[PDB]
Short mmCIF file of C-alpha atoms in Angstrom, two decimals:
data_model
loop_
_atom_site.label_atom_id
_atom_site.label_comp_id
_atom_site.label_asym_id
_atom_site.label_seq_id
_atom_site.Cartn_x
_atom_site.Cartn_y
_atom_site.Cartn_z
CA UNK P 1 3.27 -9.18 -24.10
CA UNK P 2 2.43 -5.49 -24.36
CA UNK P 3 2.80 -2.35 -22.04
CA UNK P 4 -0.64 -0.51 -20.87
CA UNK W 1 -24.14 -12.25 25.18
CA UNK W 2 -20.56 -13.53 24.93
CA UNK W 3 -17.27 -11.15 24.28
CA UNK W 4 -17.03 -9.88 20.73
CA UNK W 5 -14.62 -8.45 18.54
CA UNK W 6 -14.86 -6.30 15.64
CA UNK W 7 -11.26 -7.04 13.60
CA UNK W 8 -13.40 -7.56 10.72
CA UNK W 9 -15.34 -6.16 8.46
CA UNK W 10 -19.04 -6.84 8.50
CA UNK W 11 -19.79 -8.70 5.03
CA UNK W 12 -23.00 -10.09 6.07
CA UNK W 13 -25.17 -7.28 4.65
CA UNK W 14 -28.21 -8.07 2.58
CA UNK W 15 -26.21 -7.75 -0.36
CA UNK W 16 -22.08 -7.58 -0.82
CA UNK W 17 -22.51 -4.97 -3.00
CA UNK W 18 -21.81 -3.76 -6.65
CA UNK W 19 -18.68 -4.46 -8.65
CA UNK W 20 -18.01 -1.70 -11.18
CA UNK W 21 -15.66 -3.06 -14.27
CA UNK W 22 -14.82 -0.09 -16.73
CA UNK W 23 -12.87 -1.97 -19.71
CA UNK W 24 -11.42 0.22 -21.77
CA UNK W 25 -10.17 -1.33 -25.05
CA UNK W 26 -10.29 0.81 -28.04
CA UNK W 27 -9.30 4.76 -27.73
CA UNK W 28 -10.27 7.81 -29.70
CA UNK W 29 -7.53 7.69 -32.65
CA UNK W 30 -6.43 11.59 -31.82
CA UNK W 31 -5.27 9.99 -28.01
CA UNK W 32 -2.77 8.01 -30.15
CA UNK W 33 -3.56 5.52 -27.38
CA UNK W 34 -3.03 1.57 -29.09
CA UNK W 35 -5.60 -0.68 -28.27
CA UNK W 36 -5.55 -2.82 -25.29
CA UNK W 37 -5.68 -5.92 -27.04
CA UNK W 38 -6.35 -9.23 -24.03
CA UNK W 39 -8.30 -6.55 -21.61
CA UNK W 40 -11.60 -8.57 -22.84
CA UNK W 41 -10.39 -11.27 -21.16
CA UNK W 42 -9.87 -9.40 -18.11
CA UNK W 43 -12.73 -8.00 -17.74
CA UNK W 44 -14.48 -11.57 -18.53
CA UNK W 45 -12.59 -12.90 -15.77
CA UNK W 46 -13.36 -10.30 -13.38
CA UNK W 47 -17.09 -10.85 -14.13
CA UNK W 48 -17.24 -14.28 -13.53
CA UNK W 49 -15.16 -14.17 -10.19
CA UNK W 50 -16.90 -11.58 -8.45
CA UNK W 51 -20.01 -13.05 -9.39
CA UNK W 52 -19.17 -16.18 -7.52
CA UNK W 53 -18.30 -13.69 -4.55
CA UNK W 54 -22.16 -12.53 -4.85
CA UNK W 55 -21.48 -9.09 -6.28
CA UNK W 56 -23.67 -7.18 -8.64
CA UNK W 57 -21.39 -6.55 -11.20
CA UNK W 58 -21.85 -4.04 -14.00
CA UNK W 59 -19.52 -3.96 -16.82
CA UNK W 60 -18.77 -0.87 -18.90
CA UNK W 61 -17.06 -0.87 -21.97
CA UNK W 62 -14.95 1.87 -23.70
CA UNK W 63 -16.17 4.86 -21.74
CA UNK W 64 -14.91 8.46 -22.38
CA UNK W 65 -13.52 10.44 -19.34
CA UNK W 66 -16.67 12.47 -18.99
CA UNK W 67 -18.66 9.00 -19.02
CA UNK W 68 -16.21 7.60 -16.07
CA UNK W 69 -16.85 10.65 -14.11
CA UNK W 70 -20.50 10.63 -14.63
CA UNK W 71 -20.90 6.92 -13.69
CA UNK W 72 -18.78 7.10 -10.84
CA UNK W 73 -20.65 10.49 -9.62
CA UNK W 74 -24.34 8.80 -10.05
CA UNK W 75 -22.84 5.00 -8.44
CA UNK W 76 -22.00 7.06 -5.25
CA UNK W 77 -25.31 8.37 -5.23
CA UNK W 78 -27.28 5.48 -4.81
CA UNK W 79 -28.65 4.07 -1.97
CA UNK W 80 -25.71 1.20 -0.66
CA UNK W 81 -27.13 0.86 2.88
CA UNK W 82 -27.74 -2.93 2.47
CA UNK W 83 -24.61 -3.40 0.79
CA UNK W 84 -21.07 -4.34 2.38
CA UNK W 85 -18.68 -2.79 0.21
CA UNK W 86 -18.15 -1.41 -3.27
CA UNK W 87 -15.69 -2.97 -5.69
CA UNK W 88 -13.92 -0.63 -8.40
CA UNK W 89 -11.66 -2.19 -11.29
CA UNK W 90 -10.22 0.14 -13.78
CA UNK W 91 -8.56 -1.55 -17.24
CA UNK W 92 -6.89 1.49 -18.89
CA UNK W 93 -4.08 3.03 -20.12
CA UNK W 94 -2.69 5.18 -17.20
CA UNK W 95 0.28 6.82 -15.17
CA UNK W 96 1.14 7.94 -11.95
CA UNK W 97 -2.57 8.92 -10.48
CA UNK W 98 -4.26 8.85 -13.16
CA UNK W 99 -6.37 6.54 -15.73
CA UNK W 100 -7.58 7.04 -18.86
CA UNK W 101 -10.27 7.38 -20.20
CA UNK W 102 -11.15 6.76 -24.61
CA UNK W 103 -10.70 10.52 -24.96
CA UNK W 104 -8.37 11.62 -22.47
CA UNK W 105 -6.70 11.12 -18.83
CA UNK W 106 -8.94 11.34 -15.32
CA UNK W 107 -7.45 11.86 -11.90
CA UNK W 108 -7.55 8.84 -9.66
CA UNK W 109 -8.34 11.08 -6.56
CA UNK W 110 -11.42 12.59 -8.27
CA UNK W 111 -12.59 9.43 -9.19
CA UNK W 112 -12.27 7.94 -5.22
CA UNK W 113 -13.39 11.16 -3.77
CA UNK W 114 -16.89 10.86 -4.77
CA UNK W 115 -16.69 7.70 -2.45
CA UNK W 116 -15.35 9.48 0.32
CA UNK W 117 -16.62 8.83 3.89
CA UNK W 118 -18.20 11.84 4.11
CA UNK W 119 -19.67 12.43 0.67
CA UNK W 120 -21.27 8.80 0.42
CA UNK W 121 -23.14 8.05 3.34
CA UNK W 122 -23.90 4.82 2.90
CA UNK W 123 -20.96 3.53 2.34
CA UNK W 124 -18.93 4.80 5.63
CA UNK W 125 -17.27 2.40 7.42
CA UNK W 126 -17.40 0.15 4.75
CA UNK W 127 -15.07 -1.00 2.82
CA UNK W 128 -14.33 1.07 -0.67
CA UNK W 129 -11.98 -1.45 -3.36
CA UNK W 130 -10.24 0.02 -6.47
CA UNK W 131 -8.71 -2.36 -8.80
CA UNK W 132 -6.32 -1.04 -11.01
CA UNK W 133 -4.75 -2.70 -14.02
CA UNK W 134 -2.76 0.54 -15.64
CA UNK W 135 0.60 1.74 -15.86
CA UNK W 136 2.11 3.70 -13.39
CA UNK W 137 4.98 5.37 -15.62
CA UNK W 138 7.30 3.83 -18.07
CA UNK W 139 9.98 2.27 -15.52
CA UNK W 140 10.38 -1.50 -16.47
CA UNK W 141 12.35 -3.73 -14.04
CA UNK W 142 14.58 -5.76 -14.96
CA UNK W 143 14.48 -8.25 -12.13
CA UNK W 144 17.52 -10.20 -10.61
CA UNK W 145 18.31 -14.04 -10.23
CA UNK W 146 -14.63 14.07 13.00
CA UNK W 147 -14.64 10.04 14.24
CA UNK W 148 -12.89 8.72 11.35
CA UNK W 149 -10.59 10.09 8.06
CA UNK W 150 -12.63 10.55 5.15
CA UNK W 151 -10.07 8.60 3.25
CA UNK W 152 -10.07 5.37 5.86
CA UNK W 153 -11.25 2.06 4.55
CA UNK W 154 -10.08 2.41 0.91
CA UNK W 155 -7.64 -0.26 -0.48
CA UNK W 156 -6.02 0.09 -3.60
CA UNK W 157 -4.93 -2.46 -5.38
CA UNK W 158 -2.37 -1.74 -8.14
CA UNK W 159 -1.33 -4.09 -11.10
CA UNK W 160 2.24 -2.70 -10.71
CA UNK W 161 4.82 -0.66 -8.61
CA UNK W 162 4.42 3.58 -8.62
CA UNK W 163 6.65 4.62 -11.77
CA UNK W 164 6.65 1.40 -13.51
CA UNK W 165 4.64 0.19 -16.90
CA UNK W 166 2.10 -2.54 -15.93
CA UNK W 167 2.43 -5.94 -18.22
CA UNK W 168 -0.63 -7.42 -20.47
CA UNK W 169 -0.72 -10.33 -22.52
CA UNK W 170 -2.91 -10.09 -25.86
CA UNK W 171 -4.22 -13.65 -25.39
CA UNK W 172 -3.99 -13.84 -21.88
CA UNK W 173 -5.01 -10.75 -20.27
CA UNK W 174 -2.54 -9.11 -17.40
CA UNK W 175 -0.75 -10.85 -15.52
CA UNK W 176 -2.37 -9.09 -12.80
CA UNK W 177 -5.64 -9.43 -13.62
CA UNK W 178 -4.76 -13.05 -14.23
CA UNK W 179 -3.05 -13.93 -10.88
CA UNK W 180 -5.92 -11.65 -8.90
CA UNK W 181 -8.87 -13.70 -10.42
CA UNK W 182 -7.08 -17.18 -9.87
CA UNK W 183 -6.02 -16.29 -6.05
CA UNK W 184 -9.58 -14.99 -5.71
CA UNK W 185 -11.30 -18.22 -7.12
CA UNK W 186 -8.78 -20.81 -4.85
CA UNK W 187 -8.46 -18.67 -1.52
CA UNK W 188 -11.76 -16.28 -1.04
CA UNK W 189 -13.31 -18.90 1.05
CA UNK W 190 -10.48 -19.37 3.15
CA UNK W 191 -7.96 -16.08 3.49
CA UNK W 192 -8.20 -12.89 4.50
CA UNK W 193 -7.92 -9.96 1.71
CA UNK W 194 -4.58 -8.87 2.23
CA UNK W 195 -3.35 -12.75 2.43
CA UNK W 196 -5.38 -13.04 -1.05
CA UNK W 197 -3.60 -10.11 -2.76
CA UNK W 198 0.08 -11.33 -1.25
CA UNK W 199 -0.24 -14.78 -2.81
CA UNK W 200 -1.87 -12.27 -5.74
CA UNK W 201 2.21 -10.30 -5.47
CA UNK W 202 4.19 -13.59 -5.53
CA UNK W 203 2.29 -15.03 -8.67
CA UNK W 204 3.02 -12.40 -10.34
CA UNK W 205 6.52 -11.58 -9.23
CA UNK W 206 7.58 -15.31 -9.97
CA UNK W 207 4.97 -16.76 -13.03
CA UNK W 208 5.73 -13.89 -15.35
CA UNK W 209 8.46 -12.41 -17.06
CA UNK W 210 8.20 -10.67 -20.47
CA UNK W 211 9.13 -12.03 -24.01
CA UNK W 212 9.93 -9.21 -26.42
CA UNK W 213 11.79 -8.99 -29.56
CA UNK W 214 12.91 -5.59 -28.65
CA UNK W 215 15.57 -5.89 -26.07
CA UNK W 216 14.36 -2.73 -24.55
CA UNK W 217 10.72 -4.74 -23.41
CA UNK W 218 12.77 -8.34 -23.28
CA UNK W 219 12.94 -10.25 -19.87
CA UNK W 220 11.00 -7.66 -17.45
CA UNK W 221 9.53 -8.45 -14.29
CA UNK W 222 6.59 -6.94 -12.52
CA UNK W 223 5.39 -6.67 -8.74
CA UNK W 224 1.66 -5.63 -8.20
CA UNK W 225 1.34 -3.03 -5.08
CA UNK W 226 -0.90 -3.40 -2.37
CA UNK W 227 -1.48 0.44 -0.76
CA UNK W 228 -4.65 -0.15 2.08
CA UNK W 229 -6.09 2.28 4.13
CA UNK W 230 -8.14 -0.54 5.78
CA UNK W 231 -8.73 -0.59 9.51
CA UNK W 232 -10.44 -4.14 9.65
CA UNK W 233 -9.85 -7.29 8.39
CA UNK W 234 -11.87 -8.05 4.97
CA UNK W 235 -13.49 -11.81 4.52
CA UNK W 236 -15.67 -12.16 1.48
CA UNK W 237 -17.13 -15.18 3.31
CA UNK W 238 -19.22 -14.78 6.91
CA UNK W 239 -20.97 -17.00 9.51
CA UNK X 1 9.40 -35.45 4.93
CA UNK X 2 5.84 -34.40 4.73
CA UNK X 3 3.91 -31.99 2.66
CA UNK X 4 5.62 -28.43 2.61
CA UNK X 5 4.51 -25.29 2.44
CA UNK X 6 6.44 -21.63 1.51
CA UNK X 7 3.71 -18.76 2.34
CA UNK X 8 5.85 -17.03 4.78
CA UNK X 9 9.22 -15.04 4.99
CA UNK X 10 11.75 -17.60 6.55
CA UNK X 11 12.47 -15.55 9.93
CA UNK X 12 14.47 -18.06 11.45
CA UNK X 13 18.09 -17.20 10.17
CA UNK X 14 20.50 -16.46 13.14
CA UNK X 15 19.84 -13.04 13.37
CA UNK X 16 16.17 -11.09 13.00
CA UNK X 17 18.26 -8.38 11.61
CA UNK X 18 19.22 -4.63 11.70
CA UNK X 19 16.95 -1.79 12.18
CA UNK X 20 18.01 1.63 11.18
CA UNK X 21 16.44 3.83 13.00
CA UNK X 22 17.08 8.02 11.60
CA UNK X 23 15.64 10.46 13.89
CA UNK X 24 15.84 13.77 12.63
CA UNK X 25 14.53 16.04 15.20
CA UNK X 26 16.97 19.55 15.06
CA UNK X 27 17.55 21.10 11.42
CA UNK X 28 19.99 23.46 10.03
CA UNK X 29 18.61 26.86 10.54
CA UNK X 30 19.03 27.39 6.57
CA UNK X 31 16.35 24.94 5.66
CA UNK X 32 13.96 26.46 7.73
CA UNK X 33 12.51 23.57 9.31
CA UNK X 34 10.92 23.63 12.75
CA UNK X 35 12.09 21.25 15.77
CA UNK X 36 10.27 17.76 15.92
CA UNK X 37 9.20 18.12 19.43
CA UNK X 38 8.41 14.38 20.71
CA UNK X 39 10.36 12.51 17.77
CA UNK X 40 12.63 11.22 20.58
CA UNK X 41 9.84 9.71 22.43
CA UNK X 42 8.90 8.09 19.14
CA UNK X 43 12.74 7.11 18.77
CA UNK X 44 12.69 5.61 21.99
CA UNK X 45 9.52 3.74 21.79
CA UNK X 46 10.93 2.64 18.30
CA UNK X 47 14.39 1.23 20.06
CA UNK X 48 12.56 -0.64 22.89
CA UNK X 49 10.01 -2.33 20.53
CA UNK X 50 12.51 -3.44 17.75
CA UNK X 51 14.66 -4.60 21.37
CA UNK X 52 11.88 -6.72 21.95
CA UNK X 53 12.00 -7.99 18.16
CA UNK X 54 15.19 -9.44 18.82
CA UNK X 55 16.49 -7.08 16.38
CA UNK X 56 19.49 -5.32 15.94
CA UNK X 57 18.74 -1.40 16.40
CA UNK X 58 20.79 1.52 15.56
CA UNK X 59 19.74 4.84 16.64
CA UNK X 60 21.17 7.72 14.38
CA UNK X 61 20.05 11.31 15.67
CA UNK X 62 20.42 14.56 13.12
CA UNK X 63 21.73 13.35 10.06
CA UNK X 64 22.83 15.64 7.15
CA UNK X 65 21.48 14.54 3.61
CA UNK X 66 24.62 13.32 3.21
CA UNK X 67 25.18 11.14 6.33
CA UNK X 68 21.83 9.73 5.40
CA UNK X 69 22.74 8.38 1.98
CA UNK X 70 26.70 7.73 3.07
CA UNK X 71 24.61 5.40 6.09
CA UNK X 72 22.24 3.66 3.90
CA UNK X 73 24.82 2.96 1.10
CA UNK X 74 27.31 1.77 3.86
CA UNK X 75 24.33 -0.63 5.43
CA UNK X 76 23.20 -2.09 1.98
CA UNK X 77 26.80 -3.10 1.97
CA UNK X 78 27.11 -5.10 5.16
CA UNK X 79 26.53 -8.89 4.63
CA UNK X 80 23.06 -9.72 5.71
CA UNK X 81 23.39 -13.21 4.67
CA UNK X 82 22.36 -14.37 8.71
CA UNK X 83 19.88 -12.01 8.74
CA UNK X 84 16.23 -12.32 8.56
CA UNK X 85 14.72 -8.84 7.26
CA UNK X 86 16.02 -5.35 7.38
CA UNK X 87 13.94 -2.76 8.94
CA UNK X 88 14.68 1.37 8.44
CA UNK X 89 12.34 3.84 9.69
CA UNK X 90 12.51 7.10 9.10
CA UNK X 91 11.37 10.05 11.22
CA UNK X 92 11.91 13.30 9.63
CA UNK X 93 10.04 16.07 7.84
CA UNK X 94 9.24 15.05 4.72
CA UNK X 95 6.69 15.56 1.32
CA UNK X 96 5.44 12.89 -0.94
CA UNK X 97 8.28 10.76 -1.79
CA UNK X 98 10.85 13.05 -0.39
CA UNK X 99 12.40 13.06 3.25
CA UNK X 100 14.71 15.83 4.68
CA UNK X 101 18.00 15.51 6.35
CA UNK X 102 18.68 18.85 8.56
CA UNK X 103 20.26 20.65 5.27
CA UNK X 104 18.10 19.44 2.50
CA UNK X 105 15.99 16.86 0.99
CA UNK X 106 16.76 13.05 0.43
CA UNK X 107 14.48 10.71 -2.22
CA UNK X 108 12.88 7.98 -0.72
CA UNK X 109 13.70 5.91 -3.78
CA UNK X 110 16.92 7.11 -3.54
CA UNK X 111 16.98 5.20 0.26
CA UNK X 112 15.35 2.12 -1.10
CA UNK X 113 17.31 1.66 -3.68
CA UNK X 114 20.94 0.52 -1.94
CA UNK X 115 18.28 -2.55 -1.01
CA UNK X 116 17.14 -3.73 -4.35
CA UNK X 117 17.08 -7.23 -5.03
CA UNK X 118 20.23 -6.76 -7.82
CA UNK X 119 22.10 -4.45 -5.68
CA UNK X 120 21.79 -5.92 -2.05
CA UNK X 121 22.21 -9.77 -2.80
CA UNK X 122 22.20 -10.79 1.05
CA UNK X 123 18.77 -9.53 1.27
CA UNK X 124 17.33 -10.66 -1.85
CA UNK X 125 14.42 -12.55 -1.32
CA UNK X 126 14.07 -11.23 2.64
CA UNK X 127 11.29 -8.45 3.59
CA UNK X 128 12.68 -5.28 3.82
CA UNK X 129 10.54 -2.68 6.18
CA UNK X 130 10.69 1.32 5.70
CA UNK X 131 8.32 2.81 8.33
CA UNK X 132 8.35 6.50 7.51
CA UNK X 133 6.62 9.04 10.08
CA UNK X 134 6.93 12.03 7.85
CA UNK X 135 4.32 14.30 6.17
CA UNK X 136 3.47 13.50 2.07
CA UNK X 137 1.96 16.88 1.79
CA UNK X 138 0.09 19.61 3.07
CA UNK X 139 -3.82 18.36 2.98
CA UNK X 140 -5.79 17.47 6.06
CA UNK X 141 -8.49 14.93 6.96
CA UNK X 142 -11.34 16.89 8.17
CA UNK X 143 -12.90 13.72 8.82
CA UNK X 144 -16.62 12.20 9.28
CA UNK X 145 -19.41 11.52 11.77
CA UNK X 146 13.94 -17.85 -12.44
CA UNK X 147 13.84 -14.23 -11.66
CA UNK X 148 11.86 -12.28 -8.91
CA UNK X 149 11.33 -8.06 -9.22
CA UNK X 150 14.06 -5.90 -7.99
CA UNK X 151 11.24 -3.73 -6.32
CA UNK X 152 9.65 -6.83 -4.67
CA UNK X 153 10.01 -7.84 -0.89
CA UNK X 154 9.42 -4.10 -0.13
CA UNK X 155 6.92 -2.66 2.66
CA UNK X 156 6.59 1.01 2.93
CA UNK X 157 4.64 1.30 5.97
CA UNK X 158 3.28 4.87 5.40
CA UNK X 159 2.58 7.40 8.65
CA UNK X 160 -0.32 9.04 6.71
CA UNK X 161 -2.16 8.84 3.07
CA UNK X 162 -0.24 10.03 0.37
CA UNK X 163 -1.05 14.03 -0.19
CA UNK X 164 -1.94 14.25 3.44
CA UNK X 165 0.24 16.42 6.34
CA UNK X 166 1.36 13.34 9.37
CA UNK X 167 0.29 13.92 12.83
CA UNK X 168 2.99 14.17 15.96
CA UNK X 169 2.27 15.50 19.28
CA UNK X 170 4.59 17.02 21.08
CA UNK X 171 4.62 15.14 24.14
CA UNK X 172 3.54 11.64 23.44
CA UNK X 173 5.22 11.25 20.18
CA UNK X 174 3.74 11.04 16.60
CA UNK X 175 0.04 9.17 16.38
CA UNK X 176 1.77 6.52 13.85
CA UNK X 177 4.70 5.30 16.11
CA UNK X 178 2.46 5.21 19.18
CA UNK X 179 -0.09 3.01 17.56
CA UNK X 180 2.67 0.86 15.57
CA UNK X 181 4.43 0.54 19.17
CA UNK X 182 1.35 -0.55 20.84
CA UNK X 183 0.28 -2.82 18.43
CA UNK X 184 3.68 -4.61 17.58
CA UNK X 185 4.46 -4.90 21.90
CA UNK X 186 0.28 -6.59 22.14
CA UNK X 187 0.28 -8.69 18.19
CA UNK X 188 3.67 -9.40 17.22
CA UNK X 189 3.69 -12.64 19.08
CA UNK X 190 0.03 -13.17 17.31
CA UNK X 191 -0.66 -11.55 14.28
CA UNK X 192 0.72 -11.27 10.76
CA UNK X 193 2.33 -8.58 10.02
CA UNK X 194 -0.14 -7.07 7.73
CA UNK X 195 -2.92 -7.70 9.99
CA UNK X 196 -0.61 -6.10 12.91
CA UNK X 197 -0.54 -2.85 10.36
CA UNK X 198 -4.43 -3.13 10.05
CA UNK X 199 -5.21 -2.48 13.88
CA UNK X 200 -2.56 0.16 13.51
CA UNK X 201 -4.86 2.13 10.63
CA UNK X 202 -7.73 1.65 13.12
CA UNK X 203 -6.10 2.69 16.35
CA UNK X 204 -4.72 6.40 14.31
CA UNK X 205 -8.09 6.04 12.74
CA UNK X 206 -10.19 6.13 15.87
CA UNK X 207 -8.46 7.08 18.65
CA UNK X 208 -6.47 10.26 17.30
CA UNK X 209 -8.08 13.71 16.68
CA UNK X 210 -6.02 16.66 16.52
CA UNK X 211 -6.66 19.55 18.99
CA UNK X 212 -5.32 22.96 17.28
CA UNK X 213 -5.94 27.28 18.42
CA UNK X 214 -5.69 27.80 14.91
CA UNK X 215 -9.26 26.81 12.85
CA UNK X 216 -7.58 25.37 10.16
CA UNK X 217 -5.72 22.65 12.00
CA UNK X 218 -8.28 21.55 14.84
CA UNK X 219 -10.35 18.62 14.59
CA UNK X 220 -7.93 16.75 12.16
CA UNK X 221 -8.08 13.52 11.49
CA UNK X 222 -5.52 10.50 9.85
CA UNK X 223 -5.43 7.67 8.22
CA UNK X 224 -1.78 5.52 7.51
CA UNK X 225 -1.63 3.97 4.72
CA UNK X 226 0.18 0.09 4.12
CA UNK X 227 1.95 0.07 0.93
CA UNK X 228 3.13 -3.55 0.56
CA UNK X 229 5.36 -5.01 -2.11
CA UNK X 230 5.64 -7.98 -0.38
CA UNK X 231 5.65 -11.68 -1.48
CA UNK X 232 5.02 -13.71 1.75
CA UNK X 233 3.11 -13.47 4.88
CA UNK X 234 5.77 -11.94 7.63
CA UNK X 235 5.24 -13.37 11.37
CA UNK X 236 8.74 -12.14 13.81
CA UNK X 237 7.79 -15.34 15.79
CA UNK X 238 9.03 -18.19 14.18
CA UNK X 239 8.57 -22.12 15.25
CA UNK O 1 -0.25 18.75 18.11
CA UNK O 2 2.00 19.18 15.50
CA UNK O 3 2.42 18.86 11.55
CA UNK O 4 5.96 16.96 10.36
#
C-alpha cells in the first residue's frame, strides 16, 4: 500500500 | 406519440464516445515525484471496462503537463456530435485541484474548462466524466469501529475525500480504481451512475484498509467522493 | 428468512431525525455583510418540507460564530441512537469552505466534524445531510445557448459549484432551496435521494436566470453541485 | 436577485  | 420524459441522459448516439486514460507512472527525477508503482494495472482495467461499455478509449502514458494540456485542448476540438459523452480518468500524483503531470502540477479547472458548455459545442448537454485517482492533500483517516451553466453536466468522480491522500496498492492498483472497474463490470447494465459509484463508496469504505509498517500509514481508511453537476440521470445501457 | 439485501440507509428507526436548520439573515454591522433578503422564505419552505419528512426541525435565526459551533457541538452530543439521519442546512453568507455567523467566519469542516463517525457514535453508520445555500466564491456562470471512514456517510448538498457566487432572490427565496423544496414535496415519496438532487441541478439549471441593472451580474446562470460521501442509497419512505 |  502506497500514498499517490 | 405517447407522454415522454427526459430524466435521462440520451446514450443512444451513434457512438458513446471517447474515454481518455492519462497513466502517469514514472516522473521527471527533479519532481522528486516516486513512481506510481500498480497504476498499470489501473489503467489496464480501465481499458478493458470501458471498452465493454463501447467507448473509444485512448490510453496515454507518462505525459508531461504541457502534453496533458495539449491533448486535452485538441480532444475538445474534435467533432463529438455523434457521441454521448466524454469520459476523463486521470492516474497521477495530485492535491487539492490539481494533478500532475511527469514534469510538474496542472490545474484541474483548466483542464475541464476546455470542455465547458460553451467552449465545446458538441458536447453541450452531454454528459462530461472526470475520473480521478490522485491525492487530495496528505490527511489520512483513521476510520472508527444563457439556457444552461457552462459548468452543468460535469461529474467528478474522486478516488478520495478533499484534503485526504488517495490509497494504491503496487500489485493491485487503487482501491478506487479497483472497486470503480468491478461495480462498473457487475452493475452498468442494470444501475444508474450515481447508484454505480455509491456501491463504488461502500467497497471502498469497507474492503480496504491500509497495512503499513510505519504506524504513521498503518490501518487507514479511505472514502471516494462523488461531486456531480449532472441534471439527468446517466445509463450506459439504452432501448 | 429469505435472501437479504443492505443497499440502502435503514430509515426505519423510531425517529427520521433532527434537522438543524441556521438561518443567518441580519449580521453584525462590523463584518460588513449585507441583509439576506428572502432567507426566511427559504427558512420557512425548509421547516414545512423537513415537517413533511417526519423530521424533527429546529429553526435557529442569527447565530454568532460562536452560537453556531456551541449548537453543533451541543447537537453531536445528543443521543441519536433512535434516529434515522441527521440533516443541517445552512443558510448564510459564505466562501469556499467557509460560512459566516453575523460576527465572523465558521469552517465548514469545523461543522462537520462534531458528526464524524469516531466522534458522534449514535450516528455512525447513518447519512448525515449538510445542505448549504451559501456562496463558494465570487465567479459567475455566464452560461450557454471492521472499520468504515470517519468522513463517510456524509452528503454536502452544495447551493452552487465550488468557486462560483449562489443565487437568492429577494422575494421568492434562494434558487437552491426553492428547487430542493419543490422537488423533495413532488419525489421524496418516489425517488432516491440522489436522483431527487439530480432534478434539483436541472430545475436551478433551467429554470433560473438572474435578472441584474448592473452588466456584470445580469443574465447569470447556476449550477448546484452534489457532493456525496455516502455509502447507501437514501429513500425517507421506508416499507 | 441577489449574491449570498
Amino acid at each position: 500500500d502506497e500514498v499517490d | 406519440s405517447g407522454i415522454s420524459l427526459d430524466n435521462s441522459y440520451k446514450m443512444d448516439y451513434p457512438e458513446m464516445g471517447l474515454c481518455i486514460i492519462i497513466n502517469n507512472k514514472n516522473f521527471h527525477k527533479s519532481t522528486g515525484m516516486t513512481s506510481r508503482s500498480g497504476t498499470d494495472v489501473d489503467a489496464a482495467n480501465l481499458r478493458e471496462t470501458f471498452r465493454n461499455l463501447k467507448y473509444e478509449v485512448r490510453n496515454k502514458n507518462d505525459l508531461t503537463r504541457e502534453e496533458i494540456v495539449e491533448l486535452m485542448r485538441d480532444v475538445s476540438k474534435e467533432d463529438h456530435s455523434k457521441r454521448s459523452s466524454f469520459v476523463c480518468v486521470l492516474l497521477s500524483h495530485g492535491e487539492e485541484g490539481i494533478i500532475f503531470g511527469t514534469n510538474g502540477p496542472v490545474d484541474l479547472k483548466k483542464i475541464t474548462n476546455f470542455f465547458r458548455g460553451d467552449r465545446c459545442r458538441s458536447l453541450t448537454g452531454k454528459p462530461k466524466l472526470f475520473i480521478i485517482q490522485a491525492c487530495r492533500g496528505t490527511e489520512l483517516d483513521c476510520g472508527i469501529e444563457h439556457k444552461i451553466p457552462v459548468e452543468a453536466d460535469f461529474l467528478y468522480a474522486y478516488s478520495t475525500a478533499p484534503g485526504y491522500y488517495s490509497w494504491r496498492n503496487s500489485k493491485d492498483g487503487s482501491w478506487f480504481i479497483q472497486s470503480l472497474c468491478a461495480m462498473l463490470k457487475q452493475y452498468a447494465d442494470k444501475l444508474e451512475f450515481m447508484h454505480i459509484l455509491t456501491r463504488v463508496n461502500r467497497k471502498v469504505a469497507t474492503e480496504f484498509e491500509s497495512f503499513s509498517f510505519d504506524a504513521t500509514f498503518h490501518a487507514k481508511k479511505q472514502i471516494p467522493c462523488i461531486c456531480s453537476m449532472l441534471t439527468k440521470e446517466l445509463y450506459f445501457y439504452h432501448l
